[PDB]
Amino acid sequence: SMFSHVMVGVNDLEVSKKFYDALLGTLGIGPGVANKSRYFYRSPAGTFGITTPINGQPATHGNGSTLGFAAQSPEQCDAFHAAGIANGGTTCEEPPGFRDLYLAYLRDPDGNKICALHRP
C-alpha cells in the first residue's frame, strides 16, 4: 500500500467504535482494538485508526478530506452504506451507484467523509 495508515479524530471513542465496527465489518475488517485513547483496525495492507485528538480540543472533519476503503464488490459498497447509516453515520448527497467504479459515500458521527470503492 501507498499508505501506512490513516487516522481520523473522533469525539466519542465508543460511539465511533460502534460505527466503524459495523461499517468496516461489511468489508471483513475490525472490530477495533484499543490502544491508549485510540482504536485500530488493522490488516496485512493498511491500518486505520480513530483517536481522541492529542491537543485536547474537539475532533472535527477536514473539508476536502475523503477516506476511501477498498471493497470487493458493489454489494459490499451497498452494505457499507446501510451499516454506517444504521450505526450513527449519515448519508451523503449521492446515493451508492456506478460513476463513469462503484462508490458509496457516508459521513461518520463526527462528519469525517468516507467512501467504499469497488472497481470490477
Distance between alpha carbon 46 and the CA centroid of its chain, in Å? 13
User: Degrees (nearest 5) of the Cα angle 88, 23, 92?
Assistant: 60
Shortest Å distance, C-beta 9 to a copy of itself: 1
Closest CA to 12 of 68, 88, 91: 88
Shortest Å distance, C-beta 111 to a copy of itself: 8
Residue 88 is given by DSSP the state T
Per CB under 8 A, residues contacting a copy of itself are: 1-10, 29, 41, 43, 45-48, 50-55, 57-71, 111-112, 115, 117, 119
Shortest Å distance, C-beta 85 to a copy of itself: 20
